[PDB]
Structure formats: structure tokens, C-alpha cells
């Protein structure tokens, strides 16, 4: 039962007027718990999960101070990158940063991450050993040189292996009622005739948490990918997820097909077969 805490930051420059749009969201596994939107009125880090509201004023004041500091760094970064890439001041660009840590089943630090993207492509990322950097190009290389000299990795590693994990464990405890609860997918199959000779069997997995899930179709006991379609896992909007996989089969032969659902919330995978 591994867990993770991740913070996602997106800054978009707006050359026409004003500062970059900055949006930060924090997540524990697949549950968002905080957010900061430079466009919002509060100008404060805000709760997005009931269990984080428990935190006192100092928490919110500190997260706000830190997230505002983050937005300013991104603001500067947008300018720095514009220069490194010799880009015009008139265009809008995007800097993204994601970082966080994972704790393993033993509840101890498993891994940390801290990566950055510029205009949707890898820019620089801390490697798994949390001691070296992966720079995608020469702009990133310059950042890498500066970060190595400033020993940024060491500082990050301390947060990722210490603070990050400590708070992740704190949130997990505080919101254990949901965070440490798996919601097994509620499954069912629907049948839709597409012609007189063919039908579509759609296997639904609903209201599950976490988002990770596998739906596979088998025909007579062997996996079938042809004649199938599986939509990307999507949020139901109430904190759970949905997904479905479908297969077109010869009408009358529905019994040969089985839908297999694997999910952390299921002791053993579920197998569905049309009525």
C-alpha cells in the first residue's frame, strides 16, 4: 500500500499585460488537497480536501508564503528560459514543475522526484538517486551546472526524504478515512446491438479509488485486444474514477467474453461475463 504526495505547478506568461498565471495543486495519491491560483481572490493556499482543513493558521500562512515564493520563482524562470531559448517577449510560455515523494508499503521513503518542463517538454529532472540531474538540452545543461554548484540536489533530497515523507504520513493519518481506504470499482456490463449480427459489450468500472486499474477482455480464456476499446480513466468528479472497456462480438457469442478487472481494492480480480 504505497502512497505519494505530489505538488504540481504551472506558470504561464502573459506578455500582453501582467504577471504569469500561476496554479499550484497538491495531491496525496489521487486526492487533491490544496491549491493556489494567482487569479483567485484569496491569494492564499486553499484547502480542497476536508482532512487538510484540520491544519491550523500557521500551516496555511506558511503554505501561502511558500507557494507565493514558488510563483515568483516561476515568474523569474519564465524570463530566464525566454533568454536561454532566445525567444520573443511577445509569446506566452509555460513552466511546469512537479515534485514529491512516495512512501512504500513499509511506509518509509521509497522515492523522490523533482522535475521541470518548459513548454511541455522535459527541461531538467532530479534523477532517482536524488543526487544528479537529467538536463534535456543545453539550456537545461546551464541550469544543471548552476544547480550542481548551488548543491540544489542535496537540499531537495533532504526535503524529499525527510519533510516530504513526514507530511505525507501526517496527511495519510489525518485523512485516513478516505486516503487509506480503497474504493473497489463497482462493475457491470452493458449490451448494445450494433447490427443484427454484432453487439458491443461494455464493461464498466465505476466509483473506484485509487485511479489505477486494469480492464482486460478475454475470449474463451485468452486475452483479446482486437475488436476492443478502452477509454482513459476519468474522474467521476466526487473523488472517484471511472473507466470502461468494450468489445464487439458476434451476437449470440457474448458468453465467450469475460471482462477482467484488477484494482487494489479487489482482493482478487473480478471477472464479468454477460448475462
Amino acid at each position: 500500500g504505497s502512497h505519494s504526495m505530489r505538488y504540481f505547478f504551472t506558470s504561464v506568461s502573459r506578455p500582453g499585460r501582467g504577471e504569469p498565471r500561476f496554479i499550484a495543486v497538491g495531491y496525496v495519491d489521487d486526492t487533491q488537497f490544496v491549491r493556489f491560483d494567482s487569479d483567485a481572490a484569496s491569494q492564499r493556499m486553499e484547502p480542497r480536501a476536508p482532512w487538510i482543513e484540520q491544519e491550523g493558521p500557521e500551516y496555511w500562512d506558511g503554505e501561502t508564503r511558500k507557494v507565493k515564493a514558488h510563483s515568483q520563482t516561476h515568474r523569474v524562470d519564465l524570463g530566464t528560459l525566454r533568454g536561454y531559448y532566445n525567444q520573443s517577449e511577445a509569446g506566452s510560455h509555460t513552466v511546469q514543475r512537479m515534485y514529491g515523494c512516495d512512501v512504500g508499503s513499509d511506509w518509509r521513503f521509497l522515492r523522490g522526484y523533482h522535475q521541470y518542463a518548459y513548454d511541455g517538454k522535459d527541461y531538467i529532472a532530479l534523477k532517482e538517486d536524488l543526487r544528479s540531474w537529467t538536463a534535456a538540452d543545453m539550456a537545461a545543461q546551464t541550469t544543471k551546472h548552476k544547480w550542481e554548484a548551488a548543491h540544489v540536489a542535496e537540499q531537495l533530497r533532504a526535503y524529499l526524504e525527510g519533510t516530504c515523507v513526514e507530511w505525507l504520513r501526517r496527511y495519510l493519518e489525518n485523512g485516513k478515512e478516505t486516503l487509506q481506504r480503497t474504493d473497489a470499482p463497482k462493475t457491470h456490463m452493458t449490451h448494445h446491438a450494433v447490427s443484427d449480427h454484432e453487439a458491443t459489450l461494455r464493461c464498466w468500472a465505476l466509483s473506484f479509488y485509487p485511479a489505477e486499474i486494469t480492464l482486460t477482455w478475454q475470449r474463451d480464456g485468452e486475452d483479446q485486444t482486437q475488436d476492443t476499446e478502452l477509454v482513459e480513466t476519468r474522474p467521476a468528479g466526487d473523488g472517484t474514477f471511472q473507466k470502461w472497456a468494450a468489445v464487439v462480438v458476434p451476437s449470440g457469442q457474448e458468453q465467450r467474453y469475460t471482462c477482467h478487472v484488477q484494482h487494489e481494492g479487489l482482493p482478487k480480480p473480478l471477472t464479468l461475463r454477460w448475462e
Partner: peptide
Amino acid sequence: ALYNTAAAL
């Protein structure tokens, strides 16, 4: 909890 210091690119 967010990281404290963020180094510029």
C-alpha cells in the same frame, strides 16, 4: 507541505 526554498533555473 511545500518545499521551502526553490532555486531559479
